[PDB]
Amino acid sequence: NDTSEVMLLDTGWEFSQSGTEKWMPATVPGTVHQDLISHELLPNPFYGMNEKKIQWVENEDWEYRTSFIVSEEQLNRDGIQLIFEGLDTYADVYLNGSLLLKADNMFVGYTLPVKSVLRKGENHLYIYFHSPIRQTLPQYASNGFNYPADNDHHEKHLSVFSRKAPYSYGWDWGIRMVTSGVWRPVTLRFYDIATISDYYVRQLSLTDENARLSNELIVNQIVPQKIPAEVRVNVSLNGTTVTEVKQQVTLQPGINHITLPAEVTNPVRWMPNGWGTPTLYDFSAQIACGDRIVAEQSHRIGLRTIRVVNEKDKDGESFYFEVNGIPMFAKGANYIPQDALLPNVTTERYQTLFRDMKEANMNMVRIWGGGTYENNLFYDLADENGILVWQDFMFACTPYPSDPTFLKRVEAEAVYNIRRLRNHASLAMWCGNNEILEALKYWGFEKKFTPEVYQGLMHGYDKLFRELLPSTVKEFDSDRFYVHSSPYLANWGRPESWGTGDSHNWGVWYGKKPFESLDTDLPRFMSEFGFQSFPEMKTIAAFAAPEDYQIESEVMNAHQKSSIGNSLIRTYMERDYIIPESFEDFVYVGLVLQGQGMRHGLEAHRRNRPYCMGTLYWQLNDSWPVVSWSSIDYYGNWKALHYQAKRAFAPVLINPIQQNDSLSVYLISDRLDTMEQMTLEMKVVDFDGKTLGKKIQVHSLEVPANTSKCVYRAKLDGWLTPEDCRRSFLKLILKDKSGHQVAESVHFFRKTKDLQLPPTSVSYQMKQTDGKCELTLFSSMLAKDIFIETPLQGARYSDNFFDLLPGERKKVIITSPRIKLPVNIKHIRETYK
Numbered sequence: 116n117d118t119s120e121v122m123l124l125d126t127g128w129e130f131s132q133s134g135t136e137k138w139m140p141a142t143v144p145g146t147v148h149q150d151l152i153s154h155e156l157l158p159n160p161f162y163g164m165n166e167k168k169i170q171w172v173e174n175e176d177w178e179y180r181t182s183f184i185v186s187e188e189q190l191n192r193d194g195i196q197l198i199f200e201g202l203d204t205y206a207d208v209y210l211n212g213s214l215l216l217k218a219d220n221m222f223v224g225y226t227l228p229v230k231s232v233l234r235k236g237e238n239h240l241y242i243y244f245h246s247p248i249r250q251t252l253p254q255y256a257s258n259g260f261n262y263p264a265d266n267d268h269h270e271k272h273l274s275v276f277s278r279k280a281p282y283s284y285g286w287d288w289g290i291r292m293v294t295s296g297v298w299r300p301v302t303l304r305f306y307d308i309a310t311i312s313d314y315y316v317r318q319l320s321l322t323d324e325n326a327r328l329s330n331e332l333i334v335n336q337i338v339p340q341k342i343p344a345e346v347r348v349n350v351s352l353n354g355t356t357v358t359e360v361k362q363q364v365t366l367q368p369g370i371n372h373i374t375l376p377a378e379v380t381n382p383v384r385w386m387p388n389g390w391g392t393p394t395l396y397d398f399s400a401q402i403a404c405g406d407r408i409v410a411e412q413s414h415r416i417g418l419r420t421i422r423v424v425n426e427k428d429k430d431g432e433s434f435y436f437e438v439n440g441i442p443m444f445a446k447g448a449n450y451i452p453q454d455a456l457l458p459n460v461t462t463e464r465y466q467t468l469f470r471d472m473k474e475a476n477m478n479m480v481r482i483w484g485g486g487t488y489e490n491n492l493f494y495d496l497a498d499e500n501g502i503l504v505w506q507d508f509m510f511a512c513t514p515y516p517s518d519p520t521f522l523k524r525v526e527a528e529a530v531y532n533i534r535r536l537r538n539h540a541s542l543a544m545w546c547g548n549n550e551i552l553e554a555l556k557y558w559g560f561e562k563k564f565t566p567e568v569y570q571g572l573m574h575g576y577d578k579l580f581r582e583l584l585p586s587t588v589k590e591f592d593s594d595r596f597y598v599h600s601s602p603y604l605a606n607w608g609r610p611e612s613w614g615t616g617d618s619h620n621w622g623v624w625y626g627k628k629p630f631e632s633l634d635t636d637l638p639r640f641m642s643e644f645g646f647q648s649f650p651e652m653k654t655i656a657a658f659a660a661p662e663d664y665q666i667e668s669e670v671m672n673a674h675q676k677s678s679i680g681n682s683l684i685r686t687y688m689e690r691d692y693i694i695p696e697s698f699e700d701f702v703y704v705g706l707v708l709q710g711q712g713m714r715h716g717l718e719a720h721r722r723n724r725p726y727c728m729g730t731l732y733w734q735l736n737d738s739w740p741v742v743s744w745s746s747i748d749y750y751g752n753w754k755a756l757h758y759q760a761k762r763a764f765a766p767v768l769i770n771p772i773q774q775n776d777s778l779s780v781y782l783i784s785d786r787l788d789t790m791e792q793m794t795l796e797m798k799v800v801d802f803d804g805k806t807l808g809k810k811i812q813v814h815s816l817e818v819p820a821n822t823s824k825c826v827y828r829a830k831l832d833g834w835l836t837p838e839d840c841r842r843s844f845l846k847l848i849l850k851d852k853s854g855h856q857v858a859e860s861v862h863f864f865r866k867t868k869d870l871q872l873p874p875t876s877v878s879y880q881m882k883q884t885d886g887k888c889e890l891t892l893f894s895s896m897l898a899k900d901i902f903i904e905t906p907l908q909g910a911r912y913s914d915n916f917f918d919l920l921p922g923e924r925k926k927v928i929i930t931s932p933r934i935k936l937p938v939n940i941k942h943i944r945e946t947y948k
């Protein structure tokens with residue numbers, strides 16, 4: 116908001132396979148693979164068995180070219196900057212005969228002075244992308260060992276020598292697409308005097324009465340002279356000025372450091388999702404020179420405190436978030452890249468994912484270390500939606516090199532992204548890596564390497580994750596928590612360690628343990644736990660042709676990357692469900708299974724507060740069509756788990772838990788106010804509609820702010836008989852003083868396969884309009900875990916994957932911009948004879 120001018124270099128690009136001298140139009144920002152796809156030069160990489168078919172690309176080099184005009188007047192601007200916000204990865208940048216840059220890090224933006232190099236008339240930019248494979252083959256050959264990066268799907272684990280998105284080389288839920296290109300925007304900036312290279316709003320203190328801030332600016336002045344300037348900072352809320360400060364300086368050639376304090380009396384605090392409004396102030400800094408604003412930069416700032424509490428206690432070592440003075444039980448998921456080709460992920464896709472988190476009652480996301488440091492948009496959406504961000508550094512599942520050159524590179528990405536992200540209200544903590552110390556301690560490396568090589572790995576770990584990264588963070592983000600690794604001490608098969616910090620509880624899934632083990636195997640903080648499902652059929656039909664709808668078709672197997680996966684789903688299914696004979700019925704019960712099992716854990720974690728202080732499931736989302744632990748498939752479709760997670764994350768929850776032939780009922784509130792004079796009411800109901808015995812009433816119940824408390828216990832013996840337990844359900848409701856409902860739950864006393872479910876018909880009525888579909892569903896008898904299925908990709912539902920209770924009408928709204936609709940209603944009893 117200044118005298119500067121910006122030219123976007125996002126049109127007129129062309130690409131070539133090096134050596135062919137053949138050029139075709141390209142899209143920038145973009146990827147080599149998409150450019151081919153666009154010209155039919157590659158098949159849909161996500162279809163069938165096409166993974167093998169597209170690998171040849173990572174063995175070639177790729178060249179990109181563009182031209183632009185510069186007028187004489189633009190050339191007389193004091194400064195002209197070319198900015199690359201992302202180059203993937205080994206890129207020689209040439210402009211008008213000049214090598215501007217040899218890029219070598221995907222996660223770094225490059226700002227380049229180019230005015231002395233530009234010409235009036237046309238100017239030619241040319242970028243040579245060395246293959247990341249062929250670039251690192253010599254590095255590999257000199258190493259004398261293979262890094263154990265199992266998720267890198269190649270004989271040679273070259274991923275670890277490159278500062279490039281780990282997941283691009285393969286992963287246990289991902290396709291290998293080792294891509295290249297200009298992956299974030301190219302901008303050209305014509306300005307006078309100076310640019311602001313950094314604007315940091317440092318919060319010094321915050322009380323109800325006053326926020327004290329330090330506006331810290333790095334101004335890069337590009338002219339030979341000493342230029343007097345007034346630096347101004349304006350603070351506004353909804354377009355109205357709250358406070359304003361200025362300062363006189365004389366700017367010197369080169370870098371200038373400027374600090375202005377500003378205070379906000381009676382600050383309006385940023386609150387996390389569920390606790391209030393995620394209020395964002397506007398901070399705007401300007402360099403004024405005479406009458407003209409030569410440089411301006413702004414941030415949206417949330418005024419809040421975040422403290423990670425990680426302290427010894429009677430139970431081991433705590434691990435929790437206190438927000439604005441209040442311990443906050445974390446509710447969320449682990450986030451992976453939204454696509455195999457990152458520039459394909461649109462503004463709308465970003466927005467919809469944040470809607471999906473907000474709607475599932477989440478207050479936190481982990482940006483896990485095998486993906487990317489996400490774009491600015493991702494964090495702006497987290498700020499405005501009240502989602503705390505746990506940021507891994509981009510290291511996962513393997514030890515990494517630690518030589519001086521490697522570390523210099525990593526240091527630049529650390530400094531680059533820390534300054535990129537440190538102004539975000541949503542940013543809560545840094546974490547050095549995913550699972551590397553657990554890897555080094557427990558994954559059997561000491562039998563795979565010489566003792567000398569093992570030790571170099573262990574020394575190299577400390578160099579990067581206990582020295583370099585914690586010290587960069589101390590320097591640039593000094594009031595933000597850092598931890599060297601998730602999980603930092605706790606291991607899933609070592610019970611003695613579960614009271615020490617955070618857990619990845621992979622006993623469920625990998626360890627084959629029943630979902631009921633989440634009730635007894637409790638963490639101080641769950642940072643990962645998970646279970647897999649096939650996506651629904653419209654997503655299968657996106658990759659598989661009708662003749663491939665078998666669990667082990669070649670095409671199905673190309674889309675399962677846990678080699679353990681498919682048979683394990685069957686094993687868990689069998690414990691709890693009758694395994695359907697049709698593949699479509701298996702997919703439907705698989706969704707129900709994943710959702711029911713996982714919510715039982717989410718529930719155990721909240722129920723066990725304050726011992727347990729958070730739960731993030733593995734994983735929120737998918738990068739392509741695949742069988743995975745996700746709760747939302749690649750096309751935006753909520754699996755059962757997403758609806759179940761929403762239910763289990765509700766601010767107030769009635770949690771009935773039945774162990775040892777006995778029912779407990781807990782009231783769990785993440786509310787900031789205490790609820791008083793509450794009534795729990797329950798009744799047993801058979802599958803035809805009919806109350807068994809009488810309503811149970813528990814009056815005078817209090818539900819304190821931020822607690823989980825037991826308010827009801829009853830033995831099952833003498834209340835219900837084994838045949839009642841298989842032919843009925845508990846309905847639970849919570850009402851305030853005046854009989855107003857604040858919560859409800861349904862409880863089944865037996866495993867679904869043990870239920871005597873009646874053959875029933877779910878009937879519906881449709882009232883279809885533009886983009887909307889109102890369904891009213893009725894069934895005389897209980898219909899178990901119903902799935903309302905439509906062929907419309909990305910259709911949203913007010914509800915789904917729920918029990919349709921006996922003779923109780925149920926309204927569901929389906930929306931999609933593409934509604935001018937086939938409905939298929941599945942339920943458990945239909946799946947078997």
Ligand SMILES: OC[C@H]1C[C@@H]2[C@@H](O)[C@@H](O)[C@@]1(O)CN2Cc1ccccc1
Binds near residue numbers: 485512549621643733
């Ligand atoms: O398996 C799905 C995910 C669970 C976490 C998680 O941190 C991701 O890195 C994984 O892909 C891998 N680890 C677990 C894992 C590590 C090593 C071997 C198997 C599984």
Ligand SMILES: [Br-]
Binds near residue numbers: 193194195196229231
């Ligand atoms: Br310049």
Ligand SMILES: [Br-]
Binds near residue numbers: 196226227228
């Ligand atoms: Br510059």
Ligand SMILES: [Br-]
Binds near residue numbers: 370371372373
């Ligand atoms: Br200075």
Ligand SMILES: [Br-]
Binds near residue numbers: 260563565568
């Ligand atoms: Br070795």
Ligand SMILES: [Cl-]
Binds near residue numbers: 774
């Ligand atoms: Cl239970």
Ligand SMILES: [Cl-]
Binds near residue numbers: 773774775776777
């Ligand atoms: Cl039981």
